[PDB]
Every structure is written in structure tokens, then in C-alpha cells.
Amino acid sequence: SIKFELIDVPIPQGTNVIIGQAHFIKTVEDLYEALVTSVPGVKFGIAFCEASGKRLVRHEANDEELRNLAIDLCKKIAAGHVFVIYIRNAWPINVLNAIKNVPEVVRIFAATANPLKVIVAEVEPERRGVVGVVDGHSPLGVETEKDREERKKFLREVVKYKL
Amino acid sequence: IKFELIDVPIPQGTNVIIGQAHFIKTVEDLYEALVTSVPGVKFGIAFCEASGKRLVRHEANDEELRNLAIDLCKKIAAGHVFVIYIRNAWPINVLNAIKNVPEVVRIFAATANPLKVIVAEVEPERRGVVGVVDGHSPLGVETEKDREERKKFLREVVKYKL
Amino acid sequence: SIKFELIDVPIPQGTNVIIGQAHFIKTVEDLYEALVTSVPGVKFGIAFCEASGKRLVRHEANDEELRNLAIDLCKKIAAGHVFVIYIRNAWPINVLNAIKNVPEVVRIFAATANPLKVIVAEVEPERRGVVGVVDGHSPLGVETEKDREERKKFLREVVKYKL
Amino acid sequence: IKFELIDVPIPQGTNVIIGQAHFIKTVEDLYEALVTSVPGVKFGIAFCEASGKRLVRHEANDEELRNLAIDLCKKIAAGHVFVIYIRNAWPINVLNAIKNVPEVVRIFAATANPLKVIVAEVEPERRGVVGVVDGHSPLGVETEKDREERKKFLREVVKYKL
Amino acid sequence: SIKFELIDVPIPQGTNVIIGQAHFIKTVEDLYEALVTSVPGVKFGIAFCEASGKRLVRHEANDEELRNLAIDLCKKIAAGHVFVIYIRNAWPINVLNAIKNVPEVVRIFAATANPLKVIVAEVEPERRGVVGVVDGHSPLGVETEKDREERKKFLREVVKYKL
Amino acid sequence: SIKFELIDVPIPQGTNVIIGQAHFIKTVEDLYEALVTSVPGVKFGIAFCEASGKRLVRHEANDEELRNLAIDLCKKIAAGHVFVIYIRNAWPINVLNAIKNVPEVVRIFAATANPLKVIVAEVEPERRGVVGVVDGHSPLGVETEKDREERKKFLREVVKYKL
To answer: Comparing C-alpha atoms, which of E151, E109, E36, F130 is closest to residue D104?
Structure first.
């Protein structure tokens, strides 16, 4: 019947992973383009699970370490049309909207640098799909006004994403 | 893997939007997306920081909605999930702005119907959203007469179509 | 999430299916427009599961075969606010971004022409939701440099989507 | 080529959005973009059909705004130009929806300031928009004190920023 | 000083022209892709005025008639970074949003099938820019409610873009 | 449109300029965010011409050289609601779509690193508007098949934006 599997996602320090679902072989080239045209010095690895035809994990990358991380995760998840992206020298917010707008892309399961698990369902031999993800940990509590003041300061004084 | 069901409270006049994002800036960006979408919108936004202090981060201009959002985040208890409750605005008035917030990657539901959130717990403190149960299953198929009434509703009551 | 069910998705040759989730009755009309204004001559069927009130499968089409395929799948999935689209004479990449931008639309579970299964969870009578999909098959291997050259040539000489 | 200046009337409480599109469906699509953006928005939309009957096409839920839009279209008298007047909503509440209407290709201005439209007439009945004069030229450069007041305004009066 | 020129734009029956402004040589390939991936049977010609380097009118097309129409208009307008697209078997609404979203594209001066003129300003030798366009003719009057009923019928019964 | 003026745009090597039109004071903060969250390490200066009230050139930056370049151009153009952006360590394609999506932004006149002129119309004292721009130079000829091969190789082997 329907079997559930958990896949642990390795995330080296300094990297972020983006996992999603698309369709059509052109996905690999369009994602490569979305990444390279978003940030000048981005280092990345992108792998896509072709679900028909030769059913090969298609890939592109300008960093071999990241290429292999992406390919390996695709092989472990082993679900049709799932794509994996590992990036360095760029954050997900720098490339996510471009990814969302790639016509082949239909879902983005996660964008994170936290411990992460992917829940996969296998229904028949070699027929798998992503049920969901476990991104990081559960909440320990609710932030206070002082906590709010602190995260506001972080965004304004450290990363300077807000004024 | 354990599966759990979470009932979602939805007071009359409100709509709930549940999704998944990342990064602490999510809460400020969602606040801005809502407030700049509709004059007088009333809302509550809560986001589950999944690392560090792991605190539910929130912004709001309505205390009732703020706490509803915080409560649901605590009940789902899944990292990077965000909850938005809104009044004086409909989801269609703000959804595209939300989709385009760079931190946002998923929107599980936008509704005013009875709603359940299905959560998977794979280990203590490690949970994720598997899906939602938005409303009820179909009772039948629209007839030509039904279609005409649907068209009339959109053109005469809400006037969203011509 | 009590009971899980597997729903097979019929896909006649020459057709593609797009399954997603939205809200509000206007969904059916907005998806109709998104489709007809994307490609001249597109043939399609679109059905949407109204989750409250009359709880009727709402549907628009310009092709009866596709209208019925869309309606039938909504009946089988039987989950509130899920929509189904079947298209001919157009590919998903020709219409997907328009669909993503429809304000009512919040999720797109799949866009494909491959063998497809929808995993549905039933928590109690008449209360169902989509857990995930199984789009195509798992990978048979990893793309080689030779495979890559052939994939590039396909996109440039056959479908001509790249230069 | 003759250049002409068109003064744009802007009643208190209203904002005008002027642009260029094509195809007759422009008017229905703009109507929908506005009405589904903000509950209770009041508006008038006029579009200059540039061929066929060459009639100014309009939609509106407010007669005052409808005629203001029609009048400006007649004064500019340039094919495919559209004019929108809105009340109970600000341009930022509806502009992205407008940008994404497939028929729309240009937006010359969105403002509540004194406004002039510069039109070029190259032959009888053949006119086009060359540009706009939105408000007035700068009087100086923002000081650090000025910046602080600007930030305070956005955070305390309109509350669009945190 | 500043000299104004008028350029008449030829538009054969059955075609539509899209004129705009972008930047960077990649514009020609990105526009080609936006067009071919939007509509299956689209026929088109796209030309772009490279404003530096070799300053060549760059082009792509799957129809020689349309290719030459695009190139010729670029040569007549002769303004840096202006692009011209001529399409058949597709309407501008089928491809405009994809064009707007191409990162290199910053302006779209016109999308039409009407008599059209482009106003160009020359400020120095070989330094030209687009001032504006004259799209079709001025209004003859204001539509009546009956006229409205008629255009509503056209969209619902003829082109079927509305319900 | 009484008087036309030509404004030269200084562009230091390594910088790109983006000139456009918006409305509302929040423009300055939204453009600041669009830039800083698009590329890590981007250096920029952004100035906006408030057209009413205090009528002050509003401006944000993380680089003084670029802040002053942006402020100076706004002073020269001197037209209500026009904004100017100068960037280093990032190319326009890395930030343009974010800018297009800022709700206050309604026009982008140019994005370039080429010799550039802004044509401004003054209808009366203190009332000015942008008529157009002269981005780079006119075409020297039409791309040959050989030129095309070289352009393709450039995009694939040098900047690597295509495969």
C-alpha cells in the first residue's frame, strides 16, 4: 500500500537548500538561468528528477560540491519531477521569486538552512511523491515586545534589509 | 511518523491564510503586504521561527486576530509555518502580494470554511504540514441552471464580473 | 488524517492535466479566462470543488471530452477547493504563470502528462484533502555528459525552446 | 509634429492613473482588477478604442469618476490611452494588478498632484502621449532631520513600515 | 539640437507588432524564448538594437517575412536598445506578460495591429531615442449602453474570453 | 510642452544606472529594500523626487559616491516623481523585476551603462517631465550568421547565462 519514508537533508554551513516540484526537461536549464542571472557570485548545484523518458537526474552547476549534494538528494528522494538546489554566496530571498516564475515550476516545498527532513510516499514500485517537509523545529514559545524590538534592530542594523 | 489533526477556529467575518516561509523578515514583509493592500484591513500575522530561539513572531493591528494567529501557530507547532487572520478584506485582495513576498514559498489554504490542518510529527519537536482539509466534499455536479445562478451572483451581488 | 486513498488520474494521449487548490466560486471563471486568453485554439475543461454552500463541482469548457475528464477527477478526488484542468493544443508551460497569478489560486499540485496518482486523506466523512501526488517514476540514473549533450540538442533542434 | 498640454482635473480624495493598452477587453479587465483589489473602492475607467468605431469605452461604479475618466480620454484624444479615477483606495492598492493585465503595456502616471499630459499630434486624428508633468520640481535635498520625519510618518501615521 | 522624426510602422493583415526598450545583448534570446514558449504555433520575428559594442540589430525568427519586418523597423527607428516583435498565429495578450517579466525589458511602447507611427528624437549624430507612439486614431465619441452590451456580447459569443 | 532640455547622465565605469518614475514618499524605502535584498554586497545609491509638499530629493544608500550620483541626477532632471538608482557589484538584470514589482513604481525609462541622455520637457517654471531617453547609439548594421554564433558563444562561455 502507501509507505511513508523520511529523508534527511544534509546542509553544510554556509549553504541553503531549495526543494520543489516542476515538470518537463527544460526545468534544469531554466533553473540554471534563474540562478546565474540573479546574483553575480552565486555558487550552486541544481538537480531535477526527469519522471519519464530516460528518467535521469538532470543537473547543472558551477560548484562540484553543490552539484553532488543536489544530485545525491534527488537520488534519495527519488520522486518524479522533484528538483533540488543548493546555493552558496546567495540567500534564497535573492533567487526565490525568479524560481517561482519559471513556467515549469509548480511547487516549492522548502527554502532553508535548518535541519530538514523530507517525507516521501511510495505507492507502487518506483512511484514516489513528496508528502511534505519538516523544516527545523517546533516553537518554544511566543516572542515578547522586547524580542520584537531586537529582531527589528537585527534587520535594520546588521543585515540592513529594513530602515 | 505520527499524523495529527488540528482544528482551525474561524470567527464570522474572518478568513485565514496558512502557509510556509523562512527567515525572520517574513513577519515584517507579510505585515507590509497586508497593510498596503487594502485601506482599513484588520489583521494578525504569526510566523514560526524554526531555529535559534524558535519563538513565534507576530505583527498585527488587531489584538483578537493577533492571538488567533499566535494560537494556531502554537497548535500546528511546525517550523516556518505562518498564519494570517484578516477582517475587512478578502483573501483575493491580498493573496498575490503574499505569493510574491520573497520569504514565502507555500500557501496551504485561504478560506473561511471549516478547516483542518494535517500535521506530521517525525520526532519530538520536529513537525511539518502534510496538507489541509478545506471545507467539505462535493455533493454533486453543477447544472446549467446552477451555472446561471453562479454567474448572476458574481455579476449582481459581488459585481466581480460583468 | 485517519484514512489515505490513492486516486488514479486518467490522461488521454495529447492531453496534460493541471491539479491545484484555490477558494471562492469565482475560481472557475478566472481559470476559464486564464486558459482561453493564453493560447489561440486551446481546448480545455476545468472543474472546481465548491467546499461550502451547495458544494457543487463547478465547471467550464470548450471541449466536452475534457470537461467530463475534469469533472470526473474532481468527483474522485472529492476534496474541497481542489480544481482540475485538462488541456489539448497547449502545454502547461503556455498557461502556468497565468494560473499561478489568479488571486483565488493558492497551490498547484501537478502539471504533467505522466502516469499520475493523487494521495487524498479523509479525516471523516465528506472531509478530504490532498496530501500529495506521485508524478511519473523515480530516477533510473544520473545524466552523463553525453546525455546532457543530447538533452541540449533536443531543446534546441526539436522543440526549439533554446538557442 | 505639434505638442499640446492637457491639464488633469483631480478632485480632493481622488487619484488618477493614466496609461496605454490595446484591445477592447481592456475595459473589462481593468474593471475587474480594481473591484477585486479593495472592498468598497469607487472608480471610473475609460479606454480609447483606436480603430473601428473609435469610441471611448467605460466601466464604473461611481458616475462622477466615470465622467471624469471619459472627459480626460476625450481631451487627450490619443488611441489606446486609458484613464482611471479612484476614491476609497490608493494607487499602491491596485497598481500591480493593473500592471499585470495582459492588455496593459504602459502606465504614464499614478498621482494626486497637479498633473499635465503632453500630447503629440502628427496629423489630424493621430495623437500620442509624449510624457507627463507630475507635480513640481525639487526645492532641495532631504536632510538627516527630514529623513527621520519621513520615516516617522511612514511608521506612525500611515503605518506602512515598522 | 533636438530633432523629431516620425517613423511609419508597416503592419500586414494578420500580424501584430510589439515595440519596446530593453538592454543587454541577452535580450534577443530571452525574447525569443518568451515567444516560443507562450504559444505552440506562433510565427514571429524579433529584432533588438544593441546600443554598444558592435551595435548590431540582433535577431531571431521562425518566419523570414516577420524577421525582415522586425529588422527593417529597427533600422528605421535606429535607437539604442529598442526591440521590435512581429507575430502571427498569436495575439499580444498571449505573450505580453512573459515579455514584461523578461529582466532585460524595461518598457513596452506599443502592442497593436493598427496604423502606427513612432516618434523618434535625434539629439546628436547616431544618438536617438523613442519619444512616444501614435497608436491608431483619436476617439470619435463616447460609447452608449447599447454599445457596451454589444462589446460584452463580442467577448462572450465571438472570442469567448468572458462568460 | 514648451521647452525641451537634454540632461547628460554620468556613468562611472563599473556602475549601471536605472531611471524611472513612481509616486508617494514610500518609494525611496521600497526601492532601497528591493536593491539590498536582491544581491549580497550590492552597493547603491537611490534618490527620488518628491513632487509635492516639501518637494525634497529623498535618498537612501550604502555607498556615498553612488548616493551623490543619484542625488545629483535628480537635481539635474528636476522632474516630479522621477527616481534614479546607481548600482555597483550588481547588474540591472539582478534587480529589475523586483523594481518593476514595487507598487509605487510605474515606469522605468532606462537601465544601462551606456552613454545616456534624458530628454526633459519644461512647460513652465518648476513643472518638468521626462519625454524620453537616448540610450547608447544607433545600429551600425544587421547581425550576420557569424555574428550570431559569436553572440551565442559569448552568452555561453563568457557570462555563462545560457547553456
So the answer is: E109
Q: How far is residue B46's CA from residue B54's CA, in Å, rounded to a whole number?
A: 12
D-chain CB neighbours of E117 within 8 Å are 122, 126, 128
Handedness of CA F38, D101, D158, F127 (dihedral sign): positive
Per the listing, cell 490532498 goes with: C130
Q: SS3 sequence, chain F?
A: CCEEEEEEECCCCCCEEEEEECCCCCHHHHHHHHHHCCCCCCEEEEEEECCCCCCEEEEEECCHHHHHHHHHHHHHHCCCCEEEEEEECCCHHHHHHHHHCCCCCCEEEEEECCCEEEEEEEEECCEEEEEEEEECCCCCEECCHHHHHHHHHHHHHHCCCCC
Chain E hits for C29, Cβ within 8 Å: 163
- Rounded Cα gap, residues D102 and E18, in angstroms: 13
CATH superfamily of the F1-163 domain: Ta1353-like (3.40.1520.10)
Do residues F22 and F41 make contact, with C-beta atoms less than 8 angstroms apart? Answer: no
* Yes or no, beta carbons of A37 and E101 under 8 Å apart: no
Q: Write the Ramachandran bin of C20: left for phi over 0, alpha for psi from -120 to 50, otherwise beta.
A: beta
Q: How far apart are CA A118 and CA E145, in angstroms?
A: 58
**Chain centre to alpha carbon of residue F63:** 16
Q: Which residues of F touch D161 (CB under 8 A)?
A: 26, 29
Determine how β-strand B15-20 pairs with β-strand F3-9: unpaired
- Chain C positions touching chain D (beta carbons under 8 Å): 37, 101, 103
The answer to whether the CB atoms of A26 and C111 lie below 8 A apart is no
- When computed from its CA atoms, the radius of gyration of chain D, rounded to whole angstroms, is 17
The x, y and z cell numbers of residue E20, run together, are: 519596446
Residues of chain F contacting residue A93, judged by C-beta atoms under 8 Å apart: 37
Collapsing DSSP to helix, strand or coil, B73 comes out as helix
Best mutation target among A106, A128, A130, A133 (most C Cβ atoms within 10 Å) is A106
The span from the CA of D11 to the CA of D21, in Å, is: 25
**A137/B130 touch (CB, cutoff 8 Å), yes or no:** no
If you search the block for the grid coordinates 495582459, which residue do you land on? D102
Q: Give the fold, CATH level 3, of B1-162.
A: hypothetical protein tt1634 (3.40.1520)
Task: Give the C-alpha distances (Å, rounded to integers) separating C69 from B64, C75, C84, C125.
Answer: 44, 10, 9, 24
The C-alpha cell of C146 is what? 553525453
Number of residues that make up chain C: 163
Contacting chains of B (3 CB pairs or more, <8 Å) are: A, C, D, E, F
- H or E element at residue D123: strand D115-123
